[PDB]
Amino acid sequence: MKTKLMTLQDATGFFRDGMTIMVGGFMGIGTPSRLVEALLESGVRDLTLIANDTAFVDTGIGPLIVNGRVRKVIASHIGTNPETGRRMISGEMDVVLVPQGTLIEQIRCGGAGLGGFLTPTGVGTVEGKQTLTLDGKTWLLERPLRADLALIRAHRCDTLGNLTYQLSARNFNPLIALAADITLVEPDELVETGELQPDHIVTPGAVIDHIIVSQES
Amino acid sequence: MKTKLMTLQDATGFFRDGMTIMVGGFMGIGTPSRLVEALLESGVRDLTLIANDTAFVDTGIGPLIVNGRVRKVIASHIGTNPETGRRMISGEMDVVLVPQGTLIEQIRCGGAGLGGFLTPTGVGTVVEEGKQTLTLDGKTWLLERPLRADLALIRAHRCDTLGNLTYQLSARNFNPLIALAADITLVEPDELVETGELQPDHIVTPGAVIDHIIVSQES
Ligand SMILES: [Mg+2]
Ligand SMILES: [Mg+2]
Ligand SMILES: [Mg+2]
Ligand SMILES: [Mg+2]
């Protein structure tokens, strides 16, 4: 048997306190909002969330933060969500701010199964990381980032999990699909295998574990 | 400089002795055939070629090798081309066999401006020879450096007049990868179309990294 097919109700079973979860979406755009809602309703806490940003208090992973479900955020920008900053300053939540280009490479590094990469980026800046001197230059050594789970939004998805995306909504989605131990997809459209043009598939079904089969109606 | 459009004859003007060239293709598939023919006809030599493999004696970059135009090959497989091995043994050609995943990441780093990366691939084996390892979190990793080239010869499926490209899955392989890691990029498209004709969601290689496009069709 072992189907990848499942419902939002089944999604609940994949959530547990303290897990690390990667979530797609750029400023809420391309965020698997239904999976995020299921995560919120599950009631799990002490989560570590990895995402491009914390969007707004009501979008992206904003609701999870506002409702106290998150212990740590790793993202590239939190300026548009005052609740993220507030919990950061109140000591209620740990926030690790990472430059976007570097955050993207760390997640890519984790999905590639590598041990780290050398960036010229951040040198002489704010430290805690080690430097490597190679040839004539100095480099900052950044480590890979992986997660227990990834919540992905896709445009089209076939029953095997091959995914395509719309430009704006793409962002972190294909990246995190490779860097999490278990991957859950919320597709705009679910179709039979063979229906997607192979030349345009972005994310291989091989890395997709579960697919939400319902439509928001 | 107000145009990326050119002919195969114009391609000859980019080939110089001793340059490093990245070439697309998987076992000969997805290789920009005509650009490689031009390269061979140009008679240039002492070249360093970077590709997934050395194909067969009569396909991909194989002819460039049999005709002594290559001093060094950096690839992940050379077994289907006996001439590569022969020249490696005789000392006629330098050959650096790189694990495929590693070769891919080296080229990706070259295109991304990174200084290198740590990989578990090859640690504790002959692949370590001549490189440094580094131990982090109790694990030992091999330090690999980025790869770039002077030129990249790319085969694309569809290409618009600005250089935006799409590929057929079966011929894609290294093409989009090398497009980002070379100083100058030349594309041999199956179909050249007007800008606006390609669906933006389907563009894989942005025209910004593409310098010249072959306009003629067929072999
Ligand atoms: Mg595509
Ligand atoms: Mg997996
Ligand atoms: Mg071979
Ligand atoms: Mg360029």
Side-chain angles (χ1 to χ4, degrees), chain A residues 2-122 124 128-216, chain B residues 3-218:
Chain A
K2 290 180 183 298
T3 311
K4 293 185 175 183
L5 275 28
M6 72 165 200
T7 73
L8 272 174
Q9 164 55 209
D10 301 308
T12 305
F14 295 80
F15 308 137
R16 56 190 165 74
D17 285 357
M19 73 190 296
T20 295
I21 304 169
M22 279 166 177
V23 185
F26 172 97
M27 288 304 290
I29 305 170
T31 289
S33 60
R34 308 173 64 211
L35 281 171
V36 169
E37 194 167 46
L39 177 56
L40 182 63
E41 308 186 321
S42 74
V44 293
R45 301 171 307 177
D46 284 310
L47 297 175
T48 287
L49 300 185
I50 299 175
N52 184 76
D53 53 71
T54 53
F56 297 86
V57 292
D58 292 300
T59 61
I61 53 171
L64 295 163
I65 298 173
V66 177
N67 287 93
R69 309 312 166 76
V70 182
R71 175 195 182 187
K72 175 171 189 180
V73 172
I74 295 172
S76 75
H77 199 286
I78 64 165
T80 57
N81 186 152
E83 177 63 3
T84 301
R86 186 190 75 67
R87 305 184 80 86
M88 180 180 187
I89 306 309
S90 76
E92 299 165 55
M93 192 176 76
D94 179 29
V95 174
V96 173
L97 213 62
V98 188
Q100 191 184 68
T102 291
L103 183 58
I104 287 173
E105 288 301 341
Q106 288 186 271
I107 298 171
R108 189 193 311 291
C109 187
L114 300 173
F117 59 101
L118 279 59
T119 186
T121 295
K129 312 177 185 309
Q130 89 190 72
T131 54
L132 289 42
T133 55
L134 198 59
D135 305 317
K137 318 173 205 174
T138 295
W139 307 85
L140 206 177
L141 169 65
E142 290 291 350
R143 301 314 263 46
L145 277 178
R146 281 190 61 81
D148 296 311
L149 185 68
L151 306 181
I152 297 149
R153 181 179 177 211
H155 177 220
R156 297 188 91 209
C157 177
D158 67 26
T159 49
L160 264 165
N162 288 306
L163 319 174
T164 71
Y165 308 89
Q166 292 188 301
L167 198 44
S168 62
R170 179 166 168 164
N171 57 81
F172 272 39
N173 290 295
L175 275 170
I176 64 176
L178 312 173
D181 292 336
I182 292 68
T183 53
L184 308 192
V185 182
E186 177 183 318
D188 291 346
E189 295 174 30
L190 173 59
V191 302
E192 292 285 317
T193 307
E195 297 302 295
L196 301 174
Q197 159 58 251
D199 302 339
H200 305 315
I201 292 175
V202 176
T203 305
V207 304
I208 299 305
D209 303 304
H210 299 90
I211 308 170
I212 298 305
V213 299
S214 61
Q215 296 191 256
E216 58 221 314
Chain B
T3 196
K4 299 184 174 182
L5 301 316
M6 75 168 41
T7 75
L8 265 179
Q9 183 59 210
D10 299 323
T12 307
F14 297 83
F15 309 144
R16 305 171 302 147
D17 279 50
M19 74 191 316
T20 294
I21 311 171
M22 266 164 194
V23 184
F26 164 71
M27 294 302 135
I29 305 310
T31 294
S33 292
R34 288 191 300 152
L35 278 168
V36 171
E37 282 176 48
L39 179 58
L40 185 289
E41 182 193 358
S42 81
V44 296
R45 43 169 46 62
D46 283 329
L47 300 171
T48 289
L49 298 178
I50 301 180
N52 179 73
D53 55 77
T54 60
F56 298 74
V57 291
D58 42 22
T59 72
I61 56 171
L64 291 167
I65 295 170
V66 298
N67 286 74
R69 315 299 180 76
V70 190
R71 62 168 273 275
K72 176 179 188 172
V73 171
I74 293 176
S76 76
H77 199 82
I78 64 179
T80 55
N81 184 157
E83 181 67 7
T84 301
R86 189 190 71 61
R87 302 179 77 93
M88 178 178 69
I89 296 301
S90 72
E92 298 181 68
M93 193 175 68
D94 183 26
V95 177
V96 183
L97 193 67
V98 182
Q100 187 187 63
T102 293
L103 180 55
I104 290 165
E105 182 67 3
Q106 284 186 276
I107 301 177
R108 193 191 72 73
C109 281
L114 303 181
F117 60 99
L118 299 178
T119 178
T121 305
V123 172
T125 76
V126 54
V127 175
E128 264 191 46
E129 200 59 57
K131 307 169 187 172
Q132 286 66 66
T133 62
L134 192 61
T135 53
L136 297 192
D137 310 350
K139 306 180 67 68
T140 298
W141 314 84
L142 206 40
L143 174 57
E144 297 279 2
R145 299 187 164 74
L147 274 174
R148 284 188 61 76
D150 294 305
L151 182 71
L153 304 186
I154 301 148
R155 176 179 180 202
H157 182 216
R158 289 167 68 72
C159 176
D160 66 16
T161 53
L162 288 174
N164 289 306
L165 319 173
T166 68
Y167 305 90
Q168 277 181 307
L169 177 51
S170 62
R172 188 176 155 154
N173 54 87
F174 277 35
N175 289 293
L177 188 65
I178 68 184
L180 306 167
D183 296 329
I184 294 169
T185 52
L186 310 184
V187 179
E188 181 172 330
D190 294 347
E191 311 177 9
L192 172 58
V193 303
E194 293 289 312
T195 298
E197 292 301 300
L198 305 177
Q199 289 184 260
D201 287 338
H202 299 162
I203 294 174
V204 176
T205 301
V209 304
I210 295 310
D211 303 309
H212 300 289
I213 306 163
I214 296 305
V215 302
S216 61
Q217 319 163 196
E218 89 173 60

